[PDB]
């Protein structure tokens, strides 16, 4: 009938204040241009919020641009029932050419629960091409 869906697009990222050595999460646009959310799928501050238990297809592309040794995208599942997140998908690539750019695309199916939160983490947030909605994006839909 009316299934939860969202396609999110990149915006300008704010520099991260401190390093936990942790991979910082991307912020997203959720309603303008090609970005949308519908049918109870909520986007709040870096998280896609799962409204309904079921199997979802989740995808993301992050275009990296450099003007380190590797670039990495991870898609992460946060739940209240446990302090540590789960790494659902990882796209990791070694970087060898002083001016370069490269996309990383990830997509797969996962069983998710109502209340679960999804985020996209990257190795270095300053390498992320944020200049257009078609190059860096993040989405999910109930099957």
């Amino acid at each position: 009938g009316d299934k939860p869906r969202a396609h999110l697009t990149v915006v300008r990222q704010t520099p991260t204040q401190h390093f936990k050595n942790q991979f910082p999460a991307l912020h997203w646009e959720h309603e303008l241009g090609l970005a949308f959310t519908k049918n109870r799928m909520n986007y709040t501050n870096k998280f896609l919020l799962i409204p309904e238990s079921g199997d979802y297809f989740i995808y993301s592309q992050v275009t990296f641009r450099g003007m380190p040794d590797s670039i990495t995208v991870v898609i992460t599942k946060v739940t209240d029932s446990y302090p540590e997140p789960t790494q659902l998908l990882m796209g990791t690539k070694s970087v060898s050419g002083s001016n370069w750019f490269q996309p990383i695309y990830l997509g797969a199916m996962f069983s998710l629960q109502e209340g679960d939160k999804l985020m996209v983490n990257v190795s270095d947030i300053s390498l992320v091409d944020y200049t257009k909605e078609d190059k860096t994006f993040f989405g999910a839909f109930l099957l």
């Binding site: 091409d129 944020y130 200049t131 257009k132």
Partner: protein, 161 residues
């Protein structure tokens, strides 16, 4: 004369007027009424006559070494160009190249192309390796009242006595 479009009325097949740049179809035409064209919301644009039911989003962000060429306006997208000492090609935005000693600047660096160097034709020289210096002519010891003890084509002009 006014651009037109066909529409499936919730009643028939009618011929509705399109909307001008800076507007979109807020409501389709009806037999009674002409198209309601509403203004594009902030950060949105339509650059042409259209029958969009939603304006386009100003989706270009200027990044890295870039600044706004055009601002987001109700009738055009935002646009970005490479900065002063920078030019764009192949998808990247890289700093202008400098002409070495021997070649000169025949085309100054533009936000589009790179500084084009050309070796100076016999009778001229290029001292420095900057992207400003063009092919400057040699000194005339003849029409100055001296003698050409030493002359160098590549650089250094000439030395008279």
């Amino acid at each position: 004369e006014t651009p037109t479009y066909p529409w499936r009325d919730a009643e028939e097949r009618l011929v509705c007027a399109q909307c001008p740049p800076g507007t979109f179809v807020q409501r389709p035409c009806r037999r009674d009424s002409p198209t309601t064209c509403g203004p594009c919301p902030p950060r949105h644009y339509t650059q042409f006559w259209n029958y969009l039911e939603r304006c386009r989003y100003c989706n270009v962000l200027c990044g890295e070494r870039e600044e706004e060429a055009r601002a987001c306006h109700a009738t055009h997208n935002r646009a970005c160009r490479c900065r002063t000492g920078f030019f764009a090609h192949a998808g990247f935005c890289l700093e202008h190249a400098s002409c070495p000693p021997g070649a000169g600047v025949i085309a100054p660096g533009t936000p589009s192309q790179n500084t084009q160097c050309q070796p100076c034709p016999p009778g001229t020289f290029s001292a420095s390796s900057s992207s400003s210096e063009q092919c400057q002519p040699h000194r005339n010891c003849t029409a100055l009242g001296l003698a050409l003890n030493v002359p160098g084509s590549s650089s250094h002009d000439t030395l008279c006595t």
